[PDB]
Amino acid sequence: SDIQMTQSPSSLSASVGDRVTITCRASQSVSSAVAWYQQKPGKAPKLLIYSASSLYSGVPSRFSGSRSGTDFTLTISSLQPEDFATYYCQQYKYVPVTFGQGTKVEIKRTVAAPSVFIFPPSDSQLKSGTASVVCLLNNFYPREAKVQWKVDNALQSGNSQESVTEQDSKDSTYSLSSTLTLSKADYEKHKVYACEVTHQGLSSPVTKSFNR
Amino acid sequence: GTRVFKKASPNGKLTVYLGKRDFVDHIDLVEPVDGVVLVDPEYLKERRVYVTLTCAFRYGREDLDVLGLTFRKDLFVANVQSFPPAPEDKKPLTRLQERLIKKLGEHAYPFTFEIPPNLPCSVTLQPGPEDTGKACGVDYEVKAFCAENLEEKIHKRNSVRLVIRKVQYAPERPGPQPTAETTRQFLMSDKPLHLEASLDKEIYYHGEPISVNVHVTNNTNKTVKKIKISVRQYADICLFNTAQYKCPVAMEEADDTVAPSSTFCKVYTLTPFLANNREKRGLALDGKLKHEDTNLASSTLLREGANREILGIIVSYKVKVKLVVSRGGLLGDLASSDVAVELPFTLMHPKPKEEPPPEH
Amino acid sequence: RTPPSLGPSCTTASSSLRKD
Amino acid sequence: VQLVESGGGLVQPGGSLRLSCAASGFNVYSSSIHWVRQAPGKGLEWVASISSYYGYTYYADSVKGRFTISADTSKNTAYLQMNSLRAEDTAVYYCARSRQFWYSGLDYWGQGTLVTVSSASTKGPSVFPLAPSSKSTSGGTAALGCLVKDYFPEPVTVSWNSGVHTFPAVLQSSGLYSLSSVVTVPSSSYICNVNHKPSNTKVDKKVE
């Protein structure tokens, strides 16, 4: 059966400067012959470490990994900006070469407040015949949050649809959105429409709204 | 670099651990072969355990109708009398040899093998799909025996033998650029035919384009019909009596015509590789370990002395530029008018950064 | 005129060693 | 010093796409050439491996009978023939260098190419604003924006002609790419254009 190359941390935040550690374990004994790659999204991987000890030529010397036996670690000592990317654990001793789940790193900022607003569905949408009503959390930290939707004090049934940006470049702050797609047939069979946010920065949930 | 190699005998009495499998041979010193053997004297049935590195020629007979019946003729073999310490042979272990006892205790005994310089490098001769057993040529083996005296037999499970390579890599300093030229004069005139040949560099790595710059200055009343161009592996094998072959591995018989009293410059590029030369049974591949796919055997690097009629398989390479000169006139087709120049280069692997050699 | 060979005989392995 | 991928696009779930990876700057006999089907965040998955110097091809099992890897080494390029393409193979396919001697992890990847396979033709988006109010202005700053909804191919380049957070798209109930995009300007005072490449339409709406 194929090998799996599962990394111990799935994602993680931590502090610009400190030491980061990704364990990766293979479903069997791939002696050595593990490889690591970073990928800022929108580009394609640079290569980081071959054979599990040797680091690639052209790489930050703050990199290297190792093997505890079947367990394969990757570690960075004093990171920097533009290292805010996902890290990929690869085994290449057998065919097929296996890859890693992924491991997302984010610059860890202090909890910014998610600046929540709301927007009625545009005029031209209502001429179409369906409504996309856009919520916009903006410029915050950390990733996790929850936007609960309502049509007259009853929650959504999956018509809502989330979509986030990554770590902002020079900000290390996120941004979220959630389109509630609902038929104009049903846009107007109600009055109340609510975007229920719950964040670290927002202990008691703030809920904005609109009736147009 | 924190790992070691280990394979033990069938019955697990005799375990062998080795640093590397590739022991590289700069022309002067061959990296010693250092390792340890562990004994489990719960099963120390016998009363002596030796060790031997062997250099041997592995050949299947022309007439041998047996699939895989290969024999080995011994070129160099030595012994370290290691289990247990024989009188007087007291030696200092290596950086490697140390960390292995520290790991395993004195349950394990050392050996060191200072390979000599005038030896073949591990080279293996390409098989045909006919042949089936262990690949033929020069292979090496550390074997781990148990037998009361040296003049005692070895039981087929009371033993382990590992295969090492002694290999070479490309030298750092690029040789001077290869140019040879020649000039033929025929009966019919004194105006000559001239052929100059130049490679772009003297060292090439496996899979790299070799670029041959030609310059035919024809002052004859003969025509150059075509221009064969070829990369040829010279082999110099020495088992019982010296053999030799020069089989071609890369070729391009482009049909360029140099008509009489014409110049010509063309730069034909050309790449060796083992995809198209698999039919050529007996061609030398580099050193095979069990049965993997090797490369076109790298150039063998002899000493500046060029000591002896050396054993094993001395490979070299040489680009050939033959001009195919139209015959006819006074002697007709009777006398051959072709003109060729041979250029020798070096084809090996570069020095690995640190890391030595399915989906590789 | 010398010992022959009828094998392909085991799977070779690698253990771990003391970092130094 | 280079590597590309030309080709790749929208194809029915029964037919064929084939991809041309027109490499440059090195020898096709010292490298091994691979194809990686990461796709859109599902993970990283290998497709193909040709070793020209030896002439061998290795295939990830899910693309055996309907994926072909070739290479015409004169042009230094390499090929992926994709017959019987399903909707799972929908991906961003990737070309990847190697050292033949010896394999020590994937040297150089390429710009990539969006393959796309679902049972629905190209469409252009319709562009409708997100026009601010008292409900989209906070502490001087207000939020203008532009939903972009219901278009099929690989996504678009917004053209407002900082604070311009643009979202990776979502696949709706119909499988048409929809994505939102805002700005934060000051509450005094701006128009948005979206330029779908596979649509030959460049809708420039204005946020009021």
What are the residue boundaries of the structural domains of chain B, listed by start? Answer: 1-173, 176-352
DSSP letters, D34-103, are EEEE-TTTT---EEEEEETTTTEEEE-GGGSTTEEEE--TTTT--EEEE-S--SSS-SEEEEE---STT-
Q: Within 13 A of A107's CA, how many CA atoms are on the CB side?
A: 20
Q: Structural domains in chain A? A: 6-107 (2.60.40.10), 117-209 (2.60.40.10)
Give the whole-angstrom CA distance, residue D117 versus residue B228.
50
Q: Map tokens 């470049």 to a residue.
A: A169
Note whether C touches D: 3 CB pairs or more under 8 A. Answer: no
Measured between beta carbons, the chain B residues lying within 8 angstroms of A68 are none
Interface touch A138/D165, C-beta < 8 Å? yes
Subunits with 3+ Cβ pairs within 8 Å of A are B, D
Give the whole-angstrom CA distance, residue B88 versus residue B91.
9
Q: Is D167 on the interface with B (CB under 8 A)?
A: no
Closest among D184, D185, D154 to D171, alpha carbons compared = D154
B156 is in an annotated binding site: no
**For B354, which residue in chain A has the nearest alpha carbon?**
A54
Neighbour-count burial of B318, counting CB atoms closer than 10 A to its CB (0-12 exposed, 13-18 middle, 19+ buried):
middle
Exposed e or buried b for every residue in A40-74, given b needs 16+ CB within 10 A? beeebbebbbbbbbbbbeebbeebbbebeeeebbb
Q: What are phi and psi of C17, to 5 degrees?
A: -130, 160
B and D: number of Cβ contacts within 8 A: 43
Give the whole-angstrom CA distance, residue B175 versus residue B202.
5
Q: D37: which residues sit within 8 A by CB, 6+ positions away? A: D45, D46, D47, D89, D91, D93, D94
The token pair that represents A115 in the structure block:
């600046």
The token pair that represents B96 in the structure block:
């490697």
Q: Within 13 A of A137's CA, how many CA atoms are on the CB side?
A: 32
* In B281-330, beta strands by DSSP E: 284-286, 312-325
Closest among A103, A99, A102 to A27, alpha carbons compared = A99
Q: Map tokens 């140390």 to a residue.
A: B98
Interface touch B273/D103, C-beta < 8 Å? no
B266 is in an annotated binding site: no
**For D166, which residue in chain A has the nearest alpha carbon?**
A165
Measured between beta carbons, the chain C residues lying within 8 angstroms of B133 are 5-8
Closest among D52, C19, B77, B275 to A68, alpha carbons compared = C19
Torsion of CA D11, D17, D21, D22, to 10 degrees: -100
Q: Which of residues 61-100 of A touch B (CB under 8 A)?
A: 66-67, 92-97
In 10 A of CB B334, how many CB atoms? 8
Asked if the D126-203 domain carries CATH number 3.20.20.70, the reply is no
Note whether C touches B: 3 CB pairs or more under 8 A. Answer: yes
Give the whole-angstrom CA distance, residue A133 versus residue A126.
11
Resolution in A: 3.2
Q: B79: which residues sit within 8 A by CB, 6+ positions away? A: B50, B51, B52, B150
B153 is in an annotated binding site: no
Q: B252: which residues sit within 8 A by CB, 6+ positions away? A: B229, B230, B268, B270
Q: Is B51 on the interface with D (CB under 8 A)?
A: no
Give the whole-angstrom CA distance, residue A117 versus residue A147.
12
Q: Is A11 on the interface with D (CB under 8 A)?
A: no
B246 is in an annotated binding site: yes
Q: Map tokens 């001429």 to a residue.
A: A127
Interface touch D103/B271, C-beta < 8 Å? no
The token pair that represents B110 in the structure block:
């050392």
Distance from chain centroid for Cα B170: 13
Give the whole-angstrom CA distance, residue B30 versus residue B112.
12
Report strand pairing: B165-167 vs B22-24.
parallel
Q: Is D103 on the interface with A (CB under 8 A)?
A: yes
Q: Residue D28 in contact with residue D11, Cβ under 8 Å?
A: no
Which method was it determined by?
Answer: X-ray
Distance from chain centroid for Cα D29: 29
Distance from chain centroid for Cα A85: 10
Q: Give me the numbers of helices (H) and strands (E) for chain D, helices first please.
A: 0, 17
Measured between beta carbons, the chain B residues lying within 8 angstroms of A94 are 358-359
Q: Residue A6 in contact with residue A24, Cβ under 8 Å?
A: yes
Closest among D122, D168, D119 to D148, alpha carbons compared = D168
Q: Residue B44 in contact with residue B188, Cβ under 8 Å?
A: no
Q: Is D54 on the interface with B (CB under 8 A)?
A: yes
Q: Residue D63 in contact with residue D91, Cβ under 8 Å?
A: no
Residue B26 to chain D, least CA–CA distance (Å)? 20
Q: A172: which residues sit within 8 A by CB, 6+ positions away? A: A84, A106, A107, A108, A109, A141
Q: Which of residues 180-199 of D touch A (CB under 8 A)?
A: 180, 182, 184
DSSP letters, chain A, are -----EES-SEEEE-TTS-EEEEEE-SS---S-EEEEEE-BTB-PEEEESSSSPBPTTS-TTEEEEESSSEEEEEESS--TT--SEEEEEE-SSSSPB-----EEEE---------EE-PPPHHHHHHTEEEEEEE-EEES-S---EEEEESSSB--S-EEEEE----TTT--EEEEEEEEEEHHHHSS-S-EEEEE--SS-SSPPEEE---
Question: Which of D30, D55, D103 is closest, CB to CB, to B275?
Answer: D55
DSSP letters, B211-276, are EEEEEEEE-SSS-EEEEEEEEEEEEEEESSSB--EEEEEEE------B-TTB--EEEEEE---SSS
Is the peptide bond between D102 and the residue preceding it cis, with omega within 30 degrees of 0? Answer: yes
The token pair that represents B270 in the structure block:
């050309």
Residue B141 one-letter amino acid: E
Mutate to test the interface with B, among A49, A51, A91 (most CBs of B within 10 A): A51
Q: Residue A13 in contact with residue A144, Cβ under 8 Å?
A: no
Give the whole-angstrom CA distance, residue D201 versus residue C5.
74
Closest among B295, B51, B56 to C5, alpha carbons compared = B56
Q: Is D133 helix (H, G, I), strand (E, B) or coil?
A: coil
Helices (H), chain B: 95-104
If you count them, how many residues does chain D have? 208
Give the whole-angstrom CA distance, residue D109 versus residue D77.
14
Subunits with 3+ Cβ pairs within 8 Å of D are A, B
Interface touch A54/B358, C-beta < 8 Å? no
